[PDB]
Structures are given as structure tokens and as C-alpha cells.
């Protein structure tokens, strides 16, 4: 037994390419479209819930995940890879930050942590890179709102808006037109729904779409009262209902 695969499974080709990473990226391309848009007072991330069977219950499966109460993530590519990445991400935010400083990590740093985990699966022995790309959107006191993209290589970059997956080229173009540095959250949510529409074939409603935002604090979602400095989570996942009401003024 014993993992004898202590050597790298990702190496340099004569051309200088790292195959496995390239292939991983390819897998991301084949993935369902997902996007992110940063407004002046919030960020929005959304994707399409490509239910793989009419008997499956798409609610029991979320592509938009809360990492910390002010940071959420969404992806494109391999769902299972993303899932374990989300668990690791939630844990690292604790073990490598909250447990040291008593406060949740700022977006760039948590993203930096996730990125590292992916980088390692690109060089460590006996493994393959993760077949996903993430879009992390969060908010921290000294950096405000932010949007990040993390690739299978471990690379990450900040965005005003962007999209990944199937119709990324097309979606990106539609966003470059509609974006401006004066958008209010509601506007971004709207642009979001419009951008997503193009990438969606059939049904397009609050049940086939998944969208969450990072905005104001939600005391109502805290669960307790009595601690002034604790005002509530900024991350909020819209409801099927909330999504449809918007599609009506779409």
C-alpha cells in the first residue's frame, strides 16, 4: 500500500507548459458559467444551477457558499473539487487567522490561503491540480468590498467584474459594456441577472439561478442581541422568491 506517489504528477513540458494545469483549466471552460460584479456598496456572485436530473432537488446543492460571514465563493468546473475546497477554506479561515487574532480574515488574505492550497496540488507528490476556478467576494473593514478569481494554478487576481466557465468570453464582453465605477448593488444585481440570461438555455428563474451578495450588515441574521460591535453578517444568499421578483423588472 503506502502512497508511493511521492513525485510530482504535474511537470514542465519541453515547451514550458504545465499540462495538468492547462487541462484543469480546460475542465473549467467546460463548466457552467458563473460571474461576479462589484458595486460601490456591495458585490454579487451568481451562477446557474444546472440540475442534472428533474428528480434531483437543486436546493440541496449550493454552488454559492459562505466562507466567513463577510465572504462568499462560487465556481466553474468540478463541483466535487469545489466542495472540498470550501470546507478547507472555511477551516483555514479559523485555524490560520480567527484563532490567532480573534477576527475573521480579510478577503485578500483568505483568498491568498485558498490559492496556496491549490498551488500545492500543482507541485505536491501524487496529486492532480483542482479542476476549478473560484470567484471570492467579500468585505473587510480596511479594504471595503472586493472580488477575486482563483485559478487551478494557484494564481489569483482582483476584479471589478468578470465571468468564468462556458460563456465567459461572451459574458465578459457584456460586462465590460455595462460596468462603471458608480453602480449601486441593486444595479450590479440587475446587470448580473441580464448577463447570466444569455448564458442560460432553457428555464431561467429563482429555482435555476443561484445568487448571493456581500452588502450591508444583517443584524436580523445574527441570531442574538446584546453586543453592540456585533452588527450581523454581510453575506446574504437571495431566495428563489427574491430572484423572481427581480426577473419581473428585468
Amino acid at each position: 500500500m503506502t502512497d508511493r506517489y511521492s513525485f510530482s504528477l504535474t511537470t514542465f513540458s519541453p515547451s514550458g507548459k504545465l499540462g495538468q494545469i492547462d487541462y484543469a483549466l480546460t475542465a473549467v471552460k467546460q463548466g457552467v458559467t458563473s460571474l461576479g460584479i462589484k458595486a460601490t456598496n456591495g458585490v454579487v456572485i451568481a451562477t446557474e444551477k444546472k440540475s442534472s436530473s428533474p428528480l434531483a432537488m437543486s436546493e440541496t446543492l449550493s454552488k454559492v457558499s459562505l466562507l466567513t460571514p463577510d465572504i462568499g465563493a462560487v465556481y466553474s468546473g468540478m463541483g466535487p473539487d469545489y466542495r472540498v475546497l470550501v470546507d478547507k477554506s472555511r477551516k483555514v479561515a479559523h485555524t490560520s487567522y480567527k484563532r490567532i487574532y480573534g477576527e475573521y480574515p480579510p478577503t485578500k488574505l483568505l483568498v491568498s490561503e485558498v490559492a496556496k492550497i491549490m498551488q500545492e496540488a500543482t507541485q505536491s507528490g501524487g496529486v492532480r491540480p483542482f479542476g476549478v476556478s473560484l470567484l471570492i467576494a467579500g468585505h473587510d473593514e480596511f479594504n471595503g468590498f472586493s472580488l477575486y478569481q482563483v485559478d487551478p494554478s494557484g494564481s489569483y487576481f482582483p476584479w471589478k467584474a468578470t465571468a468564468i466557465g462556458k460563456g465567459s468570453v461572451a459574458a465578459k464582453t457584456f460586462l465590460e459594456k455595462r460596468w462603471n465605477d458608480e453602480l449601486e448593488l441593486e444595479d450590479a444585481i440587475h446587470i448580473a441577472l441580464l448577463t447570466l440570461k444569455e448564458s442560460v438555455e432553457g428555464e431561467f428563474n429563482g429555482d435555476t439561478i443561484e445568487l448571493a451578495i456581500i452588502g450591508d450588515e444583517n443584524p436580523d441574521l445574527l441570531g442574538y442581541t446584546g453586543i453592540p460591535t456585533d452588527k450581523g453578517p454581510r453575506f446574504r444568499k437571495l431566495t428563489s422568491q427574491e430572484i423572481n421578483d427581480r426577473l419581473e423588472a428585468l
Partner: peptide
């Protein structure tokens, strides 16, 4: 890109010390 945030961005210049810094060429993750 138009959308790439640049005030927040860094991909080639990293501060190592107070008197030392490096310029990167290659895999950022690495």
C-alpha cells in the same frame, strides 16, 4: 482588462523586508 481592479492588484512586485523587495517573472502561485 478594463474590469481588472488595479489599486488592489499586485502580481510582480512584493516587499520582502523594509530594505528588500523582489520583482517576479513566472508562476505567481509558485
Amino acid at each position: 482588462s478594463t474590469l481588472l481592479e488595479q489599486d488592489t492588484s499586485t502580481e510582480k512586485l512584493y516587499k520582502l523586508n523594509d530594505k528588500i523587495a523582489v520583482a517576479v517573472a513566472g508562476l505567481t502561485a509558485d
